[PDB]
Every structure is written in structure tokens, then in C-alpha cells.
UniProtKB/TrEMBL annotation, chain C:
Record bears the keyword tRNA processing: yes
Chief place where the protein resides: nucleus
Function recorded in the entry: Non-catalytic subunit of the tRNA-splicing endonuclease complex, a complex responsible for identification and cleavage of the splice sites in pre-tRNA. It cleaves pre-tRNA at the 5' and 3' splice sites to release the intron. The products are an intron and two tRNA half-molecules bearing 2',3' cyclic phosphate and 5'-OH termini. There are no conserved sequences at the splice sites, but the intron is invariably located at the same site in the gene, placing the splice sites an invariant distance from the constant structural features of the tRNA body.
Compartment(s) where it occurs, according to its Swiss-Prot or TrEMBL record: Nucleus, Nucleolus
Source species: Homo sapiens (Human)
Domain of life where this protein originates: Eukaryota
Domain named tRNA-splicing endonuclease subunit Sen15: residues: 26-125
Keywords assigned: mRNA processing, Nucleus, Phosphoprotein, tRNA processing
GO cellular component, one term: nucleolus
This protein's name: tRNA-splicing endonuclease subunit SEN15
Similarity annotation: Belongs to the SEN15 family.
Length: 264, 313, 126, 285, 379
RNA sequence: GGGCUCUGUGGCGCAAUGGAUAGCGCAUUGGACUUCUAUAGAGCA
RNA sequence: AUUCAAAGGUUGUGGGUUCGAAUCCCACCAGAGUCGG
């Protein structure tokens, strides 16, 4: 089963199989915020870790797919064996690269040996005609993305406000979690919409291949909506070909929805 | 009602200055919290000059022909004037004319004969062939120019060329201020921004279609298109104060996006009023003379386009 | 024009506003002359104190509902739901999902038309 | 109880060599135009399959560097910085500070250089992965997560990001007499006009970084940098927009350098810029 | 050269002067008329270059001419009696003015260049004062103004008929400022000038019923294209229009009874044969000559003063901004504003002394520091 | 002025290598937008 | 409401090792930091 690391109230995923499981099984996509190991001078594509919203992590803990732990701290009693293990591993992984290095080098030489011999003979025969006319830094090391040692963490309680879960009880979290869970149960894909002036973006499928269909705005069933805001949001939705949704959780448990579109 | 060299008098109707060329005070009536002018001279002067107000039927100007645009090419072969109407629209005007007929007590069998004599200041109905015959006027539909509140106040207060009537008794910019403030509870900030902008030579219009407060045209809708889209706010000179609409970073992102799509600029205006001011000193218009204005322009810094601000051809 | 039959008939409906009645008159004038609708009428909902126009864009199709609102006002999703239920009660047919048209009218008689439905509508596949 | 978190994938020699001979071209995100309606049988399904199998290959990629291209560093948490154990490289022309005879890095510079792969961070004689570094360096004492996000976002485009040390610095009157815009009885203010008495509310938003463009990278003088291109405040997207008093305070603190607001929305960076404006009275026709 | 002309009844003697010449005529036998003024017995009077003399005769006469003449001959092509007809018809108006407590007729001589505006104005004024009347003469043609220097508007109280060569004696002659040769440069000036002098003589005729009864005579511009006709109707409906007479282009008749009130009697006339062509050079030197007959007087009877005027003494407004003193002010004009007291001409400039020397019809001090300078120069 | 360390690759920020094919991003130029707002302009799942 | 393609080179200059140099070595220009005078 999966495990998400909640530090200071933010949820990160550090493995590559947990992201695949999340997206291909539970319909949760997250957001990659790291850097790429092969593209580290660009903002187009990014890599691990994957950042989860608090609502996604709460939903995943509740349906029983992940386990929110608190980020561990080094124990300081497991340090000496750690040191000796690292030293042995470094030494053996260094002195075992030399072997396949030597083999690969002999192979990259015997592949174009004929060219070497031809060039050498040309060199020395033109030298003859002229005569008649006169370790470290090569040892490879890996920079790990996720911690390489098994540790023990203590499970976090998401239904009680704490230090590394400041979310429980806040009203905005309850509202947005109500709407997130309702939309996710209906089979939709979901993302964040800050640049579109809303709360969520709602897709009919994996956002890798589909354009979103809705921009969702979480509202309290008694809060007043300013008209100008409705007009600006409807115009923006018309400009990008997206309906404007209005979601509100009713006291009886069920959420109510309302579409907004420009007419004539 | 003064701030001008011509007639700086609140509500004297006995015009007397002396050395002047020719000023003709305009007229307007306040019907259920809306100022309207019903005279052709008044309409044409207010709209050809500064582009004041909006036509109550058309979109841009009071130019709603009750003729039909599609059938202008129908019989342009003939020599006649503007009125050419299909039959069923005049039939509907006859419906809501028999409305008036029954509402004034005349029974049906005499209504039919009286209007049959009126279907023998007037119109021309049209009708195998389709011909036309002169008819009598079914219902009056004469145009009215509908002026915004800030517009009408800038006209009466800041220029003096307009007089408003509420039950045939003219008003004053003391009780005009009071009435406009009590019907639209946010008249003061909007009129202060309107006064500030139209005093720089710009032309302010309402920005309802975009979600903002105003739009600024360089010299008018027909000459130029709007450049700036303005939102108005009021605060104290220690920056205490409530807000008309609270701005998140989702309202501003949406407003900025929809302004970039329509090639405009998102200006946020602030009106700063002193802390020594009281809610009865700001019950007079002349409080304007001690309030300050501040514009800011909100933009969208794009990270990848501004990493070399020297490259340009 | 204040003597227009529809203005006085709107006065008749015991609603209790000068803003709402004049804005309703303005939207009626915008529909019945500019947009060329047919058979537009005016019904009052005293449950919500709303003067609402019920019309037919072109003769042969179903009825539509238009609630003329000014910009000064503001709504909550609960009142939106109240008006959706009122509209459904009004035009009658429970087949199509509840929906109405909100006509936001400015001070100088500038109108913007939005359409509120109950459920999920797709952006533009019609 | 206590759950035991599994951890890590160790690249073998044969796969370290394979990761050395890596390409440089990124895969295309979507293979052509995205769809609009999910109703389909086998084209959409196979297209999604391929668009996914390419994602699980990118994210399962580890950094592999040589032991000589790597500067060796150490993390001093009590003093609060990173100490290099070797001479720095080309990054030392825009990043770091030399004190007491040794070269040192702030925590966010160290984390960004660990992510790029230019240094090799240690802590208590043991090297740190990127998870452990994220957990150690990104506290509330050193630097927060949003500030590091903005810092790295900018630094991956080419900019010079330094820490902001407060010690851094017509109408119808058809009268042919027009002058008559004397109607102006509404005085215009400015942003720094009265910010030296507003600083008494020294709380709320704060300037965090100075930003120099990428044209300033080849001739940058760390000791005498000059006047920056921008200053940066870093907030969140769910947070209150700054007021007029806070805008005046920040616009007086900054000076005559422009000031930018960076908002992070669940991992997405966006930049806005408030600027005082003076409408041109000129409209003369 | 002595020439004998016999001008029998209903005949026009056409003669005008060669350049730099002298002409001497005297009514030897009988009576004769000069533009409405009956010339006295055997009076030897002189005629200077460029001056036009189309003398029609009522009773015929025997005329002596000693000197050279550009054109000089007898003509039976004469419409001048139609002249009288207009007058004689409007002669009714004359006494009918004081019949029913009404005020007299005022009449326009409207038409383009080369029509005889001032010819009919001549005869109408002279015959007015012949029948005991005392007419108001308003001249507006700033191109060749004779009420003052051209580039101004003027008004004359006709005490007695004009003399043979010089004319009606200027006693309190109304002058007002225009500044330029052509109203095409600024119409607002002509507009408020028309209204100004119209209401001015409104007051004068209501306080001096003399001209109220005796009516008025006007001279307007010869403009027929552009805002000329618009200002023509402006002036007519401002000048209490009674009768308007068109000068031999009936296009004026068509549009003139198309844009006046029905009350206005529009009467057309073909001009006399005595209307001679006068191109640019003519009114050029006749404008400079009107400046000369303002400042130096006919035959040199005006002796003006030539000396300094302080910049600390006078302020000028240029038709609205006062003009900073610059050496562009040489040989322009200056109007002393009270109405207008008089006019003066500039000769030289003093910078560090800050005084410019002027030539003056009256001595120091000038009755006002109110001055308005010219657009045209004369030296 | 002298010593020591580091750096120099496409307009800019940068990869690569026992030492065996000089390519990534931004900017630029072009297309399609099942795009939108209207010859444009704007495009940030 | 996005998505795709093309073009773009004095690898600071010279020399050396090498069959083969952006890559390894030396010298010389240009720049940054530090020690210090
Ligand atoms: Mg290089
Ligand atoms: Mg280069
Ligand atoms: Mg470079
Ligand atoms: Mg190579
Ligand atoms: Mg795009
Ligand atoms: Mg070299």
C-alpha cells in the first residue's frame, strides 16, 4: 500500500511506482514540482516529487489507499552501521566499475580497429616519405531522489488538528473537500485552476489526452456571489471553451451544481 | 451646480450674466431612479458632443429605426420615406392599442369601428402581390436618451448644462447628491472616479460586459476603442476602510486574462480620503476638493519573455 | 412611454419595487423589439418577490424564463436554486432540466444575458 | 503503532553506465492535439497508453554524475549554511559568499545546486538524497517551500537571484473657450509618497530576492553588482491580496527598482507587477 | 488735352485716371450727378490715379476735361434708373417708417467681386441725405475697407452727401477690429463683429431715432463661396434685414430667396457698365493707400508723431493671447481701444531700452494702453 | 602593481565526452488551431 | 485551449600528445573571487 509524506502540512510522493498506481488506479494526478535529472535547465517538464493537495491526501487516506505518516527524523542510534555500510557500498561499487569499463573499452576499440591501423600506417608512411625528403573523476556515483534507507515513521491523524496537519476544522478545507469528493466519485479527473479564476478544473478523462470541460467554483450555500464576478468568470469560460460550474454542499449531505454559460 | 465660468448658480432659473455668447440649458426628467431626455435637440447635442448616455433601444446611439432592416431592399425601387413595416408588428401595436381602448371604457363594437376609421404623426403599413397603404399612428414610441447617474451629475454639477425634474420640480446638487447616493449606495466613489477621468479629456463608459467598473476611450466609441478598464475603491488616509468587492487572486487573474484577450489594461483606482473627515463633511459634494486619487496598472510578468530586455530586432 | 400597457400591468402585480419593474420593462423592450421574440408575458412570483418574463423566441418552440436583475443586487446559490424550482413550477414541463436566463441590466439600460441550468452542460458541442 | 516506510532504488553499475549515456531531448507531452469527448473504442485508449508509458519512464530517472565534476560540501545546521570542501566552479560567479577564508552557500542555493547536480551534500559523514535535503534545508528557519520553488523556477531560466539584504539601498458647452479643464479638483498621489511613516506597520509582506536578468550573467560582479532588475515578494494563491498600505510600504522599501509578486498555487508559479500610473491629460481631439 | 463731352439725359460718362496723372473736371453747363451727389456750378475738382468716375446725368450736361484719362467716353448702356427704382420703391418705406411707429428699411448690396458694392452704397447714401434722411453706413469688406484701413469694420453717420473726391466727413466714425485682410482666416471674428455693431446701432437708433427712421446702408464682403453666404444670412437676419439686392449673378438670387425669411424682398440687378476689373495689384496698393489716407491725410494734411512708446506703457492682445514683444512687430498697425480711439504704425524697436517707436495721429499720451496689432504690414 | 583559485560551447542560460555522431530550453520564423475574440489581436492542462 | 516543426557554431587564440581532441598538457589574452600590498 502507498505512503505519502506529510511535512508541515504538505503532502509529497517520492516514488515512481506510487505515482503510476495513483493515476492509473485511483484517478489522482497530482503535480510534479521537482527538476528533471536530464533537463535541469528548463521549466517545461519537471520530475519528482509529486505534490498532492490536502483534499486529495485526505480522500486517499479515507478510502484507504495511502497512509499519511509524519516525515521521520534520523534516529542517531542507527548511525555507525550506516557509516560502515555506506563505506563498503561506495568502495565495492567503485572497484566494480573498472571491470565493465575495461571490457566496454576493448569493445569500442575492436569495433574500429581497422580504422586505427589504416590511420597509423598512413601516418608512419608519410613520416617515412618525409624522412626521405627532409581513477577518481572517472568513477560514477548516483544522487538519489528518495531516501535509500528503510526507516520507521509514525502514522498521522488527519481528523484532528495538529502541527503537521493544520487543515482539520478549517471551513475552506471542509468545503473544498466536500466538492472534491463528490466530483471524484462521479468519475471525473480534477486539477487546480488558479490561472482560470476558479477552484478546480474538471476533465472527462486523463488530462494527458483530454481538454478540461468545467471550471468549478466552491461556494457556501448562503454566501452571496457578486454579479460582476459571475460576469468575469463567464466571459473567461467562454474565451477558453469551458462551462462555469457552481458547486455547493447542502446540509442533507448532497452537493448541488449549476452551470453558467453566455447566451443571446 | 457651478464649477464653470458660464452659469455658476445652484438652481436659479432667472438666467442673467451679461457678456456671454449663447448657452441653452438642457432638460431631463427622473422617472423611478432613471434620468431620461425626450427631446431630439437635447439627444443630438448630448450624443454628438462627448458621447453622453446611451440610446434606450439601440446599442450605441439613440438610432433605433422602428422600420425593418431586412425589407429596406424590398421596395427601394420606389420613392418614399423611412416608415415601411410588416403587417403583424402593426397588428401587435393594435393589440396593445385595444389594450388602451378597453382600459378607457369604450366597448368592443365601437372600438372596432373607430379604429376601422383610423385604419382607413401617421404611418404606412404594407400588405400574389404585397403593396402598401397609409395608416394612422397606433402607438407613440419616440426615443429617449437614458443618462447614467454619474453622467447626469457630471452634467448638472460639473458643467451646469442640465436640469433634472422630479415631479416637475427641479432638483439641486445637494438633494441630488442625497437622492443619487440613497438609490445607488455607491454613487460617491463611482462619480468621483468618473469626474477624475472625464476631467483629463478621456471618455468613461460602463464596463459591465467585462466585470469592471469603467472603460476609458481616448476620444469616443466611434473614433477609438477602449484602452483601460478601471476598478474603483475608497480608503482612508491611514488606509482604513471596507471594500466594494473584495479582491482575491482569482478575481484579479480572471480580470487580467479577459483584459489581455480584448487588448486592454487593468487599472486599479484608489480614492484616499483624510482621517479628519466626518460623515457629514462628506455629505456635501465639495468634499471632492480634499480627496486624493491613485492609479496602478496590474500586468502579468511572463518569466520567459523578460530574461533579456535588450533584444528587439 | 410610462403609460405603456405592460408597464402599468407590471405595476399591477403588487411586487413592491421601482427598480425591478423598470428593469423588467427594459428587458421586455430589449426582447420584444430588438431580438424579435413572440408572445412575451410577465408573471410575478411573490414567494421570492420576483417579476419574471415568460416568452417564446420564435413561434413553435417551448417557453423560456427570464429574470431581469440589476447589477446592484447579488445572489446566493440557495436563491439561484429557489429560482430554478420556481421556473420549473412555472413553465411546467418536468422533462428538460431546470434552467432560466439572468438579464443583468446596468443604469443606462445596458443588458447582459446569461443562462443558468441545473446540472452539467458541455461548453460548445451544443 | 509505527509503520516501516520502504525506501529507495539503488542503480547498479551496469545501469549507472547506461544512465551516463543518456539523451537530451524531452518527450512530447501530448502526441498532437488533445481530444474533447471521451467516447471512443481503441484509438483513444492506445493513445493514452503511449502517452502514459512515456511518463513512467521520465520520472524513473536518477541523477548520475562523476566524482570529479562534483564539489564536496557539508551542511552546518547550527551556523546555518553549507561549507564547500573543494574549490567551486562556474556557479561561484553568481552564487555564494566567502567568509573567514572559506566559501559558503545559503540553504536554497545549496538545494538548487544539489538538484542540478553540481555539488555533493553531506551531513554527519553521510551523503544526503533529495528527499532528505528537502526535509532538512526547507524548514521555517532557513527557507520555506514556496520561496525555494520561485527561486529554482527563476534560476532555471538564467536569472541571478540574490538575497535581499535590507541594507541594499468636446462636451456640449458649445462655448469656444477651451482651456477649461480647470474642473480638476482631485489631486493625484504616488506610491512612495508617505511610506516612511507607514513602515511603523512593519509586518505582513516582505521583499525576499533581488533579480538580475540573464544579460547580466557573463559580467556579474558579486562584490559590486549594481542596481537590480526587480525585487520579489513571494506569497501563496489562497492568501489575501496586498492592500494599498502594504503596496506603499514595499514600494518605498524597494526604492526605484520595480517590485514583482510571485504567487504559488498548489505548485504553479505566476508573476504580477503593480506599477503606479499617470493618465495622460493630453487627449486633445 | 481738352475734351468736350455732351452727356444728354439718361447717359453715363465713363472715365478713370491713368497712373500718376491729374484730371480736372468742372460742371460748365447744366447739372450732373456723381454717385448720387449733385456737383456744384463750375467747380474745378481733381482726380488722381486709379480713381473711378462713372458719372450718370439726370438732366444732361456739358462737361470739360483737361488731362489724360485711362478710359473716357459716353455710354448709353446704363441701368442706373433701376437704381433709383429700388430707392424710389424703398422711398415708400422712408416715410412709412414714421407712419406706423416703425423703424426704417435697411438694405443689402450683395454680390461677388466686380459688382459695384460701394457704387450703389455711394448713391444710396447720397440720395438718402438728399431727401433729408440721415443713413447709417456699415462697411464690412475687410479686403478694401474704406470706413477705415482694410482689415477692420466700420460705420458712418452721414451728415451731408459725400464730396466729389474724398467723401463723407468722419465725425465720431465707428471702428472695430478685425486685423486681417480676409474673413477666411477666422469666421468667429466676423460673427461677433456683426452681432456687436448690429446691437451697437440698435442702441444708437433707439436713442437717435434719426437713423431708425432714415434706415441704414450696409457694405458686405464680396465672398460668394464657403462660409461667405452663411455669414451673409447671419448678418442679414442680424442686421434687421429689410431688402437685399443681388448684383448680376442670379445664383445669388436663387440661394438668397432659398435661405432668407419670406419677409425679405430679394431684388436682382445687372451691374452698370462702369464696373471695371481690379486684380491683386489694384487692391494691394489701394489697401496701402487707405493706410496712407488714414495716417497722412488726403493731399498731405495729416502730420503724425514719430517717437518712442514704452513697453511699460502698453499691453496688447492678439486676436486670445497677448503677444510677447518681438521684432515681428515692425511696420504693423496698433489700435487704441476705448470702440477705437485711433490707429498707429510701427517703425523700429528698442530691446535693452525696451521701447518701440510709433507714428501717431494724436500726441502723447495715447488715451488707453489698450492696443490690438495688425496681421498685415505697411512701411 | 605581485601571488593563488575558478571560468570561457548557437542571440542568451546551458549539455556532451576512455578521446570516436557538437544538441536542450528561452527568444525568432512558419504551420494547424475541431481555438477564441473580432486585415488584425490574444492564447497560461 | 492549446499543439507541432525549422533555422541557428571562430567549442577564447596558438602550439603539443594522439590513428583520432569541446574533452588531455603547456603558453598567451579576457573576466570573477581571494590573499594581501
Ligand atoms: Mg566551452
Ligand atoms: Mg558566440
Ligand atoms: Mg554562452
Ligand atoms: Mg565532437
Ligand atoms: Mg500553449
Ligand atoms: Mg585551448
Amino acid at each position: 500500500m502507498l505512503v505519502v509524506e506529510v511535512a508541515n502540512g504538505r503532502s509529497l510522493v517520492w516514488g515512481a511506482e506510487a505515482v503510476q498506481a495513483l493515476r492509473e488506479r485511483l484517478g489522482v494526478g497530482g503535480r510534479t514540482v521537482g527538476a528533471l535529472p536530464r533537463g535541469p535547465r528548463q521549466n517545461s517538464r519537471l520530475g519528482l516529487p509529486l505534490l498532492l493537495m490536502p483534499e486529495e491526501a485526505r480522500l486517499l487516506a479515507e478510502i484507504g489507499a495511502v497512509t499519511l505518516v509524519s516525515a521521520p527524523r534520523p534516529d542517531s542510534r542507527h548511525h555507525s552501521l550506516a557509516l560502515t555500510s555506506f563505506k563498503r557500498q561506495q568502495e565495492e561499487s567503485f572497484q566494480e566499475q573498472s571491470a565493465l569499463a575495461a571490457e566496454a573499452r576493448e569493445t569500442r576499440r575492436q569495433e574500429l580497429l581497422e580504422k586505427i591501423t589504416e590511420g597509423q600506417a598512413a601516418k608512419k608512411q608519410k613520416l617515412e616519405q618525409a624522412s626521405g625528403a627532409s581513477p577518481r573523476s572517472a568513477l560514477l556515483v548516483q544522487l538519489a531522489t528518495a531516501r535509500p534507507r528503510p526507516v520507521k515513521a509514525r502514522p498521522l491523524d488527519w481528523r484532528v488538528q495538529s502541527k503537521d496537519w493544520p487543515h482539520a476544522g478549517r471551513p475552506a478545507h471542509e468545503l473544498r473537500y466536500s466538492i472534491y469528493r463528490d466530483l471524484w466519485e462521479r468519475g471525473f479527473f480534477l486539477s487546480a485552476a488558479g490561472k482560470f479564476g476558479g477552484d478546480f478544473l474538471v476533465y472527462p478523462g486523463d488530462p494527458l489526452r483530454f481538454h478540461a470541460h468545467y471550471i468549478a467554483q466552491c461556494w457556501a450555500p448562503e454566501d452571496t456571489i457578486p454579479l460582476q464576478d459571475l460576469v468575469a468568470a463567464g466571459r473567461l469560460g467562454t474565451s477558453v471553451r469551458k462551462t462555469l460550474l457552481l458547486c455547493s454542499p447542502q446540509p442533507d449531505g448532497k452537493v448541488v451544481y449549476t452551470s453558467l454559460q453566455w447566451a443571446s | 451646480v457651478y464649477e464653470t465660468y458660464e452659469s455658476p448658480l445652484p438652481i436659479p432659473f432667472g438666467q442673467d450674466h451679461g457678456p456671454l455668447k449663447e448657452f441653452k440649458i438642457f432638460r431631463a426628467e427622473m422617472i423611478n431612479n432613471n434620468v431620461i431626455v425626450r427631446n431630439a435637440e437635447d439627444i443630438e447635442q448630448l450624443y454628438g458632443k462627448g458621447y453622453f448616455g446611451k440610446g434606450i433601444l439601440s446599442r450605441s446611439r439613440p438610432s433605433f429605426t422602428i422600420s425593418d432592416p431586412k425589407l429596406v431592399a424590398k421596395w427601394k425601387d420606389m420613392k418614399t420615406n423611412m416608415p415601411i413595416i410588416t403587417s403583424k408588428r402593426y397588428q401587435h401595436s393594435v393589440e396593445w392599442a385595444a389594450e388602451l381602448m378597453r382600459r378607457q371604457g369604450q366597448d368592443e363594437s365601437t372600438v372596432r369601428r373607430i379604429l376601422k376609421d383610423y385604419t382607413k404623426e401617421y404611418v404606412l403599413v404594407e400588405e400574389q402581390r404585397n403593396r402598401l397603404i397609409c395608416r394612422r399612428n397606433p402607438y407613440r414610441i419616440f426615443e429617449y436618451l437614458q443618462l447614467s447617474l454619474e453622467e447626469a451629475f457630471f452634467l448638472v454639477y460639473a458643467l451646469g448644462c442640465l436640469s433634472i425634474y422630479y415631479e416637475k420640480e427641479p432638483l439641486t446638487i445637494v438633494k441630488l447628491w442625497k437622492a443619487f447616493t440613497v438609490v445607488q449606495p455607491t454613487f460617491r466613489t463611482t462619480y468621483m472616479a468618473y469626474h477624475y477621468f472625464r476631467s483629463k479629456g478621456w471618455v468613461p463608459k460602463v464596463g459591465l460586459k467585462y466585470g469592471t467598473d469603467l472603460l476609458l476611450y481616448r476620444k469616443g466609441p466611434p473614433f477609438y476603442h477602449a484602452s483601460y478598464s478601471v476598478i474603483i475603491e475608497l480608503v482612508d488616509d491611514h488606509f482604513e476602510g471596507s471594500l466594494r468587492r473584495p479582491l482575491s487572486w482569482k478575481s484579479l487573474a480572471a480580470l487580467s486574462r479577459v483584459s489581455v484577450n480584448v487588448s486592454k489594461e487593468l487599472m486599479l483606482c484608489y480614492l484616499i480620503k483624510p482621517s479628519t473627515m466626518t460623515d457629514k463633511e462628506m455629505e456635501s459634494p465639495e468634499c471632492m476638493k480634499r480627496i486624493k486619487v491613485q492609479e496602478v496598472i496590474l500586468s502579468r510578468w511572463v518569466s520567459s519573455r523578460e530574461r533579456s530586455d535588450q533584444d528587439d530586432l | 412611454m410610462g403609460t405603456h400597457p405592460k408597464y402599468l400591468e407590471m405595476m399591477e402585480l403588487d411586487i413592491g419595487d421601482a427598480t425591478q419593474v423598470y428593469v423588467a420593462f427594459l428587458v421586455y423592450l430589449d426582447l420584444m423589439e430588438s431580438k424579435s421574440w413572440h408572445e412575451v408575458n410577465c408573471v410575478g412570483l411573490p414567494e421570492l418577490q420576483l417579476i419574471c418574463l415568460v416568452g417564446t423566441e420564435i413561434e413553435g418552440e417551448g417557453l423560456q424564463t427570464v429574470v431581469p436583475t440589476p447589477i446592484t443586487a447579488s445572489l446566493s446559490h440557495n436563491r439561484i436554486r429557489e429560482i430554478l424550482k420556481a421556473s420549473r413550477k412555472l413553465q411546467g414541463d418536468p422533462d428538460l432540466p431546470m434552467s432560466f436566463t439572468l438579464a443583468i441590466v446596468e443604469s443606462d439600460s445596458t443588458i447582459v444575458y446569461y443562462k443558468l441550468t441545473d446540472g452539467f452542460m458541455l461548453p460548445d458541442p451544443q | 503503532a509505527a509503520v516501516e516506510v520502504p525506501a529507495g532504488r539503488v542503480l547498479s553499475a551496469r545501469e549507472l553506465f547506461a544512465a551516463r549515456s543518456r539523451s537530451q531531448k524531452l518527450p512530447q507531452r501530448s502526441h498532437g492535439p488533445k481530444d474533447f469527448l471521451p467516447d471512443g473504442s481503441a484509438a483513444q485508449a492506445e493513445r493514452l497508453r503511449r502517452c502514459r508509458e512515456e511518463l513512467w519512464q521520465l520520472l524513473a530517472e536518477q541523477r548520475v554524475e562523476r566524482l570529479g565534476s562534483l564539489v564536496a560540501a557539508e551542511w552546518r545546521p547550527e551556523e546555518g549554511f553549507v561549507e564547500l570542501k573543494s574549490p567551486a566552479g562556474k556557479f561561484w560567479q553568481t552564487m555564494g559568499f566567502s567568509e573567514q577564508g572559506r566559501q559558503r552557500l545559503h540553504p536554497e542555493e545549496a538545494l538548487y545546486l544539489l538538484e542540478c547536480g553540481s555539488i555533493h551534500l553531506f551531513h554527519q559523514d553521510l551523503p544526503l538524497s533529495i528527499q532528505e535535503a528537502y526535509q532538512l534545508l526547507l524548514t521555517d528557519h532557513t527557507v520555506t517551500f514556496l520561496q525555494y520553488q520561485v527561486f529554482s523556477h527563476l534560476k532555471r531560466l538564467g536569472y541571478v537571484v540574490r538575497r535581499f539584504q535590507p541594507s541594499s539601498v468636446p462636451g456640449q458647452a458649445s462655448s469656444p473657450a477651451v482651456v477649461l479643464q480647470h474642473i480638476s479638483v482631485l489631486q493625484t498621489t504616488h506610491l512612495p509618497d508617505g511610506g516612511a511613516r507607514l513602515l511603523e506597520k512593519s509586518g505582513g509582506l516582505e521583499i525576499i530576492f533581488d533579480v538580475y536578468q540573464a544579460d547580466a550573467v557573463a559580467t556579474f560582479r558579486k562584490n559590486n553588482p549594481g542596481k537590480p532588475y526587480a525585487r520579489m515578494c513571494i506569497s501563496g494563491f489562497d492568501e489575501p491580496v496586498p492592500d494599498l498600505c502594504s503596496l506603499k510600504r514595499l514600494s518605498y522599501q524597494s526604492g526605484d527598482v520595480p517590485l514583482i509578486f510571485a504567487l504559488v498555487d498548489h505548485g504553479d508559479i505566476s508573476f504580477y507587477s503593480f506599477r503606479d500610473f499617470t493618465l495622460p491629460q493630453d487627449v486633445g481631439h | 488735352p481738352t475734351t468736350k463731352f455732351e452727356l444728354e439725359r439718361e447717359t453715363e460718362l465713363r472715365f478713370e485716371v491713368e497712373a500718376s496723372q491729374s484730371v480736372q473736371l468742372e460742371l460748365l453747363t447744366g447739372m450732373a450727378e456723381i454717385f448720387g451727389t449733385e456737383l456744384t456750378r463750375n467747380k474745378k475738382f481733381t482726380f488722381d490715379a486709379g480713381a473711378k468716375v462713372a458719372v450718370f446725368t439726370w438732366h444732361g450736361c456739358s462737361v470739360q476735361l483737361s488731362g489724360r484719362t485711362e478710359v473716357a467716353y459716353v455710354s448709353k448702356d446704363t441701368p442706373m434708373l433701376l437704381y433709383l427704382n429700388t430707392h424710389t420703391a424703398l422711398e415708400q418705406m422712408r416715410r412709412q417708417a414714421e407712419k406706423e411707429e416703425e423703424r426704417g428699411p435697411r438694405v443689402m448690396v450683395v454680390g461677388p467681386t466686380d459688382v459695384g458694392k460701394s457704387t450703389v452704397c455711394r448713391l444710396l447714401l447720397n440720395y438718402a441725405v438728399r431727401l433729408g434722411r440721415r443713413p447709417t453706413y456699415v462697411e464690412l469688406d475687410v479686403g478694401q475697407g474704406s470706413v477705415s484701413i482694410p482689415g477692420t469694420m466700420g460705420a458712418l453717420y452721414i451728415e451731408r452727401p459725400a464730396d466729389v473726391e474724398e467723401g463723407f466727413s468722419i465725425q465720431a466714425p465707428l471702428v472695430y477690429h478685425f486685423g486681417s485682410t480676409t474673413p477666411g482666416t477666422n469666421i468667429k471674428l466676423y460673427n461677433k463683429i456683426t452681432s456687436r455693431l448690429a446691437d451697437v446701432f440698435n442702441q444708437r437708433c433707439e436713442v437717435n431715432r434719426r437713423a431708425s427712421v432714415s434706415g441704414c446702408v450696409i457694405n458686405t464682403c464680396g465672398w460668394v463661396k464657403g462660409s461667405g453666404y452663411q455669414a451673409l444670412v447671419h448678418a442679414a437676419s442680424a442686421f434687421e434685414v429689410d431688402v437685399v439686392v443681388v448684383l448680376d449673378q442670379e445664383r445669388l438670387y436663387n440661394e438668397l430667396k432659398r435661405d432668407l425669411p419670406h419677409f425679405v424682398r430679394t431684388v436682382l440687378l445687372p451691374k452698370s457698365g462702369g464696373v471695371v476689373e481690379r486684380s491683386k495689384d489694384f487692391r494691394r496698393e489701394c489697401r496701402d493707400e487707405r493706410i496712407r489716407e488714414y495716417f497722412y491725410g488726403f493731399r498731405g494734411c495729416f502730420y503724425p508723431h514719430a517717437f518712442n512708446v514704452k513697453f511699460s506703457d502698453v499691453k496688447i492682445y492678439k486676436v486670445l493671447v497677448p503677444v510677447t514683444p518681438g521684432r515681428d512687430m515692425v511696420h504693423h498697425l496698433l489700435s487704441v481701444s476705448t470702440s477705437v480711439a485711433g490707429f498707429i504704425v510701427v517703425t523700429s524697436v528698442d530691446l535693452e531700452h525696451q521701447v518701440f517707436t510709433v507714428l501717431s495721429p494724436a500726441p502723447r499720451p495715447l488715451p488707453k494702453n489698450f492696443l490690438l496689432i495688425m496681421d498685415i504690414r505697411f512701411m
